[PDB]
């Protein structure tokens, strides 16, 4: 679906923070004893509203909330870290968890270049068949 932001306002700029998974490379800063404290592991940046992507994302977060809350109702886990990993697993089971039927809408295998290789090799023996 396309996202049409239907909120009263939209802040069009996203001043963000995230973590640096490899925050140091040289020296002893990778050693926990010498490295930064909890407050200093973050990097920052600024994104603008090209293609209205910020305004779309805010609405998306809004619409995700209901389904997310219902998911949390059904689990007995105290802290859930596995939603994206389970999505990845479901992706894999969707494509390769069963038999892949070629030309079907759910099998993503292309033999078209493999078609140009076997349709060019039709002529490898049929033209020189003396």
């Amino acid at each position, epitope marked *: *679906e*396309a996202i*049409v*932001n*239907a909120q009263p*306002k*939209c*802040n069009p700029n996203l001043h963000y923070w995230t973590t640096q998974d490899e925050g140091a490379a040289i020296g002893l800063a990778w050693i926990p004893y010498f490295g930064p404290a909890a407050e200093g592991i973050y990097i920052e940046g600024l994104m603008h509203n090209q293609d209205g992507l910020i*305004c779309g994302l805010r609405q998306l977060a809004n619409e995700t909330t209901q389904a997310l809350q219902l998911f949390l109702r059904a689990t007995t886990e105290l802290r859930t870290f596995s939603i994206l990993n389970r999505k990845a697993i479901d992706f894999l089971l969707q494509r390769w968890g069963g038999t892949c039927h070629i030309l079907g809408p759910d099998c993503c295998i292309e033999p078209h270049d493999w078609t140009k290789n076997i349709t060019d090799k039709i002529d490898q023996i049929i033209h020189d068949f003396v």
Partner: antibody, heavy 120, light 108 residues
Framework: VQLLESGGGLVQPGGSLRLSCEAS????????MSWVRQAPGRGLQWVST????????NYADSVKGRFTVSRDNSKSTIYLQMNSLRAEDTALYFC??????????????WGQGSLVTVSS | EIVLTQSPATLSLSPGERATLSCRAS??????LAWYQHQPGQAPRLLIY???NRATGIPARFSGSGSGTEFTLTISSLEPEDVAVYYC?????????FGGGTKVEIKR
């Protein structure tokens, strides 16, 4: 319910012009509103959509940086402010109402169209 | 963009006949596809949404079918008032795109 468009006519290339579209018979704040244009002898091309807030605008690539769509819900009016107009922009411009605010289509009500001609 | 291609380009049919119009997408749009009628110099009118749902006030002869990359609009029995251009439109992704239209002529 009706959509009445206005503001069309002749304008020189490089100029600015603001179009308006007035809604009647329904509360404007509940629906996403769009602009669609029809060049002579051609089909329909989507131009822009505005959602619930003035910053929730989406544009065709060929109008980005040149056209701005906006709304004034208190006066029940939609606007299209155009700048840097070219010969390719002469067209009949339609306003279009969505069935809801949070998705851009189906277009269940259309205005009659206002013609904007950019020509020397 | 997702390109929408409508076929055929022209249709000349007598009243009472069935008309079948087709819209094809370059990649799947699932069921996010609507059809609009535009008769000469009047405002366009919504006919069908979500590939198969008939809009309010539209005659029962109009129906829609299809999914994925293939969709059809059927008019089961033509009357003179259906002379118009018909457009499909997808809403799965920005930019919104329209088909090129089908002009239906009534052969009286």
């Amino acid at each position: 319910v009706q959509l009445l468009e206005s503001g069309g006519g002749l304008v020189q290339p490089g100029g600015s012009l603001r179009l308006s579209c007035e809604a009647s018979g329904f509360p404007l704040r509940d629906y996403a509103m769009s602009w669609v244009r029809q060049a002579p002898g051609r089909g329909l091309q989507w131009v822009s959509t505005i959602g619930g807030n003035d910053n929730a605008a989406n544009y065709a690539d060929s109008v980005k940086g040149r056209f701005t769509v906006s709304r004034d819900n208190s006066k029940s009016t939609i606007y299209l402010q155009m700048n840097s107009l070219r010969a390719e922009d002469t067209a009949l411009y339609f306003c279009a109402k969505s069935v809801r605010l949070s998705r851009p289509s189906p277009f269940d009500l259309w205005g009659q169209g206002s013609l904007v001609t950019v020509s020397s | 963009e997702i390109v929408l291609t409508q076929s055929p380009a022209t249709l000349s049919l007598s009243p009472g006949e069935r008309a079948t119009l087709s819209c094809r997408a370059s990649q799947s749009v699932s069921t996010y596809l609507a059809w609009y009628q535009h008769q000469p110099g009047q405002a366009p009118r919504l006919l069908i949404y979500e590939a198969s749902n008939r809009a309010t006030g539209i005659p029962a002869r109009f129906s829609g079918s299809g999914s994925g990359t293939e969709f059809t609009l059927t008019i089961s029995s033509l009357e003179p008032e259906d002379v118009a251009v018909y457009y499909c439109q997808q809403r799965a992704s920005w930019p919104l795109t329209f088909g090129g239209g089908t002009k239906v002529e009534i052969k009286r």
